[model samples]
Target: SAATREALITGARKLWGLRGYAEVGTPEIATEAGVTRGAMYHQFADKAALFRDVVEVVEQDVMARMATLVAATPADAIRAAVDAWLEVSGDPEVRQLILLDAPVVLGWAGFRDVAQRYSLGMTEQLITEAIRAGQLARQPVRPLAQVLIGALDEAAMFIATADDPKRARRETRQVLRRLIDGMLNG
Candidate 1:
């Protein structure tokens, strides 16, 4: 059972990351994972179902990692979040797959719904805590979280597709650092 689930998850991840939902075929996914189409279908009802599971797996893993990075203090939490976000944004897979492919391939609404439903809660909680502690500016948690996430996504996309990735990282970090500082000070 574990092996089968792993295979399916792996296949879904590879396909979604590499070719996205619309472009990646079932047979191609199976081939990528060294599994048969029958095996793939047996684990998932359809491609969309497979993608849902894969997204859940990736989201859960990322959240778990972020939870580990969160600090007890408000200022530390913001720093940790920004640092973690930088690391994630610089990651090739995170940039190309989760950030870019998700919106473009899954449809913007579907991607937004999934991200909001599953991920934004933690960000909102962190921002609320920071504001409560006076580490962040007084602002609505939802809108602040949305802006922060959108900015990070855009930054990651720009870096991932840039002509010079190293330069992109430098520019993105500078911009993000200023934004984060402004959120806290302004």
Candidate 2:
């Protein structure tokens, strides 16, 4: 039973990571998982439920990576986290799944709930630490984190959809750095 579930999750993760929610269907996902459609239906309500599980797996991985990225620098944690977010967001899979399709499929509220559980919490923690360490101003951490998350999402989409993603990423990072500097120093 456990092995079957794992297969389903792994297969769905790979497929969903490569393709968005709309393009892939249940039959192919079940086939990819090496299980029959009946097995897939037995395990989950529908494709959306399976996709939600996949999203959780991906979100935790991203959060863990972000945690490691900023682990060494307490003073620069917030900025480092921003840099890492931008970097990870450059990945086509991350850009497509987490940034674009998740929100639309899960709805903004649902998407925000998952994001807040992982990325937003990390951002808030880093912001709080930066403020405590005198690296940032005494602003409300939650609101700031929310704003930054929104901006980062928008930045990722802008880059992902651009004809020149590399150039878009560079220009977006420049603007983001300026915004972060203003937030930190002003």
Candidate 3:
């Protein structure tokens, strides 16, 4: 029987998420998926292609999480969005697939391209709303979004590698909030 594509992604994500991409061979991923290697290959062009699919799924989930946080914490929507993603950064799946191996394997250009579509664009919307609400001073949305997105990236990596993730998250959140506050309108 052909293994479902979803099963393959789940299986592949588990293996690749636990082990770095270079060490997880294609056959093993197929075995993890309970499919023949040929089936796995057919489902995806190659391991990297499978990784890209996994990245997209992981990021889409992050985006969904961000959306909920923004809605739930409307008073602090920007901070909520940042916090939601930073929390996800510590998850093994996100730590390995997105933070660690993605840059090296997918290349910064490709991996950032994937991320920009998610967080970068979302930041622009978030900032735009803040300005409209008079919470933040009017400024160029795109550049600010890019700068904020980069800070979030660095903050995520900091928490991801920290000895105490909770403490790191708490510390980083304060810094990000202060940075956000800097842009607040009178």
lDDT by residue (1-186, candidate 2, tens digit) is: 677778888888788778878889988988998999898888888988888888898888888877777774444565677788877777767777888778888998999899888877777877887787777889887898889888987888888788998899889889988888788743
lDDT for 25 in candidate 2 is: 91
List the candidates' TM-scores in order: 0.80, 0.91, 0.89
Candidate number of the best TM-score: 2
User: Candidate 3 residues 1-186, lDDT tens each?
Assistant: 334688888887888888878888888888878788777777788888988888888889878877876676222787677677776777788898898888888898997898898887778888888888888878898998888788889889888888998898889889988887676654
Candidate 3 stretches greater than 4 Å from native: 1-3, 73-75
Q: What is the C-alpha RMSD of each candidate to the true structure, in Å?
A: 3.0, 1.8, 2.2
- Screening candidate 1 with a backbone cut-off below 3 angstroms (N, C-alpha, C), the clashing residue pairs are none
User: Of 1 and 2, which scores higher on TM-score?
Assistant: 2
Measured with C-alpha atoms, the lDDT of residue 7 in candidate 2 is 89
Tens digit of per-residue lDDT, candidate 1, span 1-186:
568768778876866666566777777877777788787788887877777677777767667777776642676677677677667556555565667666765678888787777669888988888888878778777888888777776777777788998897888888887877777843
Runs with alpha carbons beyond 4 Å of true place in candidate 2: 72-75
For model 3, state the Cα shift of residue 7 in Å.
Answer: 2.2
